Design a protein around this ligand. Structure first.
Ligand SMILES: [Cl-]
Ligand SMILES: [Cl-]
Lengths: 131, 131
């Protein structure tokens, strides 16, 4: 997780709005959430990994430890139980709620941070780049 | 809780710059902090409680459960071990780190929300009101 430390800006974004409706995000919200250009900020402090996302939509932040599951209240106001792991080079976050489950993958490609979000079939791709 | 849920704006501060130097914050960052008028958002989602602070300098979103110890990265970037309780009608937060310890009281007083911060002898006082 040392290769993720830094402030990142949103460059591209595709299949996002399609991903939202699958999770169960409201119409009016998907239009404002997807309309935003977040500023993902990852930083570590010992065993703690913080992922602060300052967007024009919401302002979320999650501090955690690898493997140890924690309570997370998503931006779209959804109480989920998340668990982030360093599976094969990437930061794989699995969010469980109401039996349902989604997966946020944060991989790396050269000078970019690629975020993948799966919600059964539909998978979004949002590319980031050092601010 | 529930008597804290809602949005609060800062309307006054006393001994904040005096209290921060005791915590150990740097002159530079101590000046920008006291110059900020943060908005403290407080919500509840089940047994989980979220207190968020939004201002011109540093944004924090601390989600927690009453009486259960949790890891927190303070705005001034300290790796503290916090624990919040409903003590005598007040949301009492205690931050332990490096042997030191600071207490943050969050009580209500009519239409106001009083925040008292104790660090040894000094005590910062900041009041908020519904947005
Ligand atoms: Cl790089
Ligand atoms: Cl009231």
């Amino acid at each position: 997780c040392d290769a993720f430390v830094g402030t990142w800006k949103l460059v591209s974004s595709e299949n996002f709005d399609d991903y939202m409706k699958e999770v169960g995000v409201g119409f009016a919200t998907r239009k404002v959430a997807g309309m935003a250009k977040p500023n993902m900020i990852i930083s570590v402090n010992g065993d703690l990994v913080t992922i602060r996302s300052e967007s024009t939509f919401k302002n979320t932040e999650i501090s955690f430890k690898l493997g140890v599951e924690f309570d997370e209240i998503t931006a779209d106001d959804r109480k989920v139980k998340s668990i982030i792991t360093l599976d094969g080079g990437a930061l794989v976050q699995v969010q469980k709620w109401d039996g349902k489950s989604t997966t946020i993958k944060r991989k790396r490609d050269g000078d970019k941070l690629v975020v993948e979000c799966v919600m059964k079939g539909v998978t979004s791709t949002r590319v980031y780049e050092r601010a």
